[PDB]
Amino acid sequence: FPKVATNIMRAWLFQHLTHPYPSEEQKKQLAQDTGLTILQVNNWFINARRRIVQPM
Template sequence: MCMEYEAAGSCSSEVEGIEFGYGTRGVGDKELKEMLLRKYSGYLSSLRKEFLKKRKKGKLPKDARIALMDWWNSHYRWPYPTEEEKLMLSEMTGLDIKQINNWFINQRKRHWKPSSEMRFGVMEGVSGAAHGTILEHM
């Protein structure tokens, strides 16, 4: 809308020679859309290509996925690589640490379920450690 001209009573714009606005002949939505698409379709198509470039890049390279899966399979019981292991995997695969972290987060969410004894062991370790520190201070 062109509010600064609204008070003067003439608010109109021109698109390919057709005026529309307050008090001028109106153009149907469909006709206006077609007109704008004809005029700006090249620009819209280049914008679409630009947005597609910035989208998610997709799957990781096959050799990188294989290396990560090898590590995963040999550490399935506790699939949390150390920082040193992440650096080693990064050098081996050519992936960023962030990509490796995300791959492991997704892999654990989708394919790993800690055993019940592991969950109880972790809980006992936490409560045992807390209990031990309390006793030491008494």
């Protein structure tokens, strides 16, 4: 489900908040867990990092 994919990636993000950049291997593992493509996983984390630092 979409909520499952979102919660997988959010959990990874908050466990890696000081280095929120998945390696190529970690992207493949996340793609498998979420059912998303590698490209979609990377897009999600690009957006997450942008949103985190976005001005209040």
